[PDB]
# Entry
Amino acid sequence: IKDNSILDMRYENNKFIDISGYGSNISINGDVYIYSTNRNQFGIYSSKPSEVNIAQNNDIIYNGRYQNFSISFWVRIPKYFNKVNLNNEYTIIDCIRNNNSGWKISLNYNKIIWTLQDTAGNNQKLVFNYTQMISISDYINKWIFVTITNNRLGNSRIYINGNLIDEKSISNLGDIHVSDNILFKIVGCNDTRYVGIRYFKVFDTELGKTEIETLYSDEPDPSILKDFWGNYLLYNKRYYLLNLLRTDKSITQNSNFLNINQQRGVYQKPNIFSNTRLYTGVEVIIRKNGNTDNFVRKNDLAYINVVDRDVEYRLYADISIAKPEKIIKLIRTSNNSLGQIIVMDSIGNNCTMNFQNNNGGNIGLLGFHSNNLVASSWYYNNIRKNTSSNGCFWSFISKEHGWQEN
Ligand SMILES: CC(=O)N[C@@H]1[C@@H](O[C@@H]2O[C@H](CO)[C@H](O)[C@H](O[C@]3(C(=O)O)C[C@H](O)[C@@H](NC(C)=O)[C@H]([C@H](O)[C@H](O)CO)O3)[C@H]2O)[C@@H](O)[C@@H](CO)O[C@H]1O
# Structure
């Protein structure tokens, strides 16, 4: 609960502010990127002046040895692509006093690291391990929710996306005097890099499982759908399509049809990364039908078109087919609904698209049947419960700096 928060970083009126009430002063030095669609998201750089500093309220600088506390925030880490990234630990969030007591969040190739140390020098480390040798990653260049909880007379725990990952006793810990400041700055990184950070908070209690799941599900506006990277999905923006069941397949334009039988392919660099190609297949765009923003929200009505060199083709469910699988056809488009619309929605972070006629009657969920995309009513009564592996689940991939390919 917000009642136990002693530091709440938000962006407002072109600067960061602490809305917890303790009033810590937050200053931005150098070049700090602020995301346009969600100002609470910022990026810091490793090779040039760039940092966000929080001069903690004196009454918050924990010098105790019994005080319980927790921290949470989301971090966005670009794909590592150089050998210099392999064994190069660097801190991104620092609250260490005179190179000794305190806590800090650092990173390294395939790692997110938490360190907690006392005045004597004793410390404890928690680490989340992930990989770059994987077809599709839930971590690389995507917002990752991190949560550290500490019970002085118990354990220190690190959570990732709401789940418990590592846990160790901090009983060997005595007096812990944190730094007066909480510095967001990439320090010790031997490469030219940056990291994204959002919704950083500190609590004076040991957050429980249920309070962590709440922070995970609420912080970012839950009514707005998300793209592949975890950012807000937008109208009038090009995206590549990824089917969550057949993640190895590319969605291609055949004639006036859409195939999903071709391989996306693999992009790799020996001993650094190996992943299926994301930027392949047709580029689509989401268009509004007949407000103050371009955010695609749950239940919104919209049109989906393939963007082919300045020509847009509306995705049309061929309702002239009696079978439940109505192949998707491409029809050159501007306001003609063609007798149908698409209901945008999602189960978790999994996007769904439901083709319906004008009277609100269901035609079918976008999916595939043989080797083609189709709108099928079969999905309504055939969705696997807790798994993204459903032919009617999709992700929209925007080509961005944090993930480069051929
Ligand atoms: C083929 C068959 O006899 N089944 C008919 C149904 O076919 C399914 O139709 C839906 C769309 O309406 C999908 O195209 C489905 O494809 C998958 C799927 O579940 O998405 C592709 C999966 O990759 C595949 N999994 C594996 C491991 O191979 C599954 C799987 O074969 C089935 O779930 C097992 O039954 O299928 C099509 O299989 C559909 O046409 C209905 C209604 O007309 O009639 C069935 O007879």
Q: What stands out?
A: The CA atoms of residues 63 and 177 lie 4 Å apart. The first helix runs from residue 209 to 218. Residues 245, 324-325, 367-369, 376, 378, 391 surround ligand 1 (CB under 6 Å).
